């Protein structure tokens, strides 16, 4: 069985727990690690080359009080760094998370995710999201509450870890139904805005 420890980090309140819990089996088969106060969600995705399991480490809120302990990071093979596109300070703190992460983990593939893009009054827009470009990371807009772009970070990570740029997910995992609607037009605009931003500067 192919599996990877994936650490999910970012400021308190950015939507990490809401994001990981979208995956229904990941939630039903989650494991609590009492010593570190972590829940590990085993998220299986079915690819054209078979199942890949991401064991996603979600905190119990301790990130609100400072950096996470070494044991949280140890043996991570990949990571998602999340911020909230409605809270500029959460984006300002991304470089801190990246530092703390790479201090313990070095090499690993990392996706940067701007969460909550379902919220109309967006504060951190495409033109301001630069950190990934500075550090060779992949970026996605997401909305945990609507499942918007849910699979994207996992698929990018899988391709990187497996070393197969043509890897595909055969089907989406079973997800909790969207609690909010992600306006298709809005999504189209944000995707374009990221394209424009990517070709810019």
């Amino acid at each position: 069985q192919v599996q990877f420890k994936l650490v999910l980090v970012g400021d308190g309140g950015t939507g990490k727990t809401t994001f990981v819990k979208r995956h229904l089996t990941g939630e039903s088969e989650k494991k609590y690690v009492a010593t570190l106060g972590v829940e590990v969600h085993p998220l299986v995705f079915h690819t054209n080359r078979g199942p890949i399991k991401f064991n996603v480490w979600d905190t119990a809120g301790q990130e609100k009080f400072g950096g996470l302990r070494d044991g949280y990071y140890i043996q991570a093979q990949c990571a998602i760094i999340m911020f909230d596109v409605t809270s500029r300070v959460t984006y300002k703190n991304v470089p801190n998370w990246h530092r703390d992460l790479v201090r313990v983990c070095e090499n690993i593939p990392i996706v940067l995710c701007g969460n909550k893009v379902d919220i109309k009054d967006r504060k951190v827009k495409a033109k301001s999201i630069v950190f990934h470009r500075k550090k060779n990371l992949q970026y996605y807009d997401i909305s945990a509450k609507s499942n918007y772009n849910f699979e994207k970070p996992f698929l990018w990570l899988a391709r990187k870890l497996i070393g197969d740029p043509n890897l595909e997910f055969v089907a989406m995992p079973a997800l909790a139904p969207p609690e909010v609607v992600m306006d298709p037009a809005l999504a189209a605009q944000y995707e374009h805005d990221l394209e424009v931003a990517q070709t810019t500067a």
């Binding site: 494991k31 690690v33 570190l36 044991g71 949280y72």
Partner: peptide, 26 residues
């Protein structure tokens, strides 16, 4: 040989008596 932690799922060495991550016993 190596052993997967049944508490946190991290892969550990044969030498390891406890998990390098979560300190759980083999």
């Amino acid at each position: 040989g190596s052993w997967d932690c049944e508490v946190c799922l991290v892969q550990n060495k044969a030498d390891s008596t406890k998990c390098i991550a979560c300190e759980s016993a083999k």
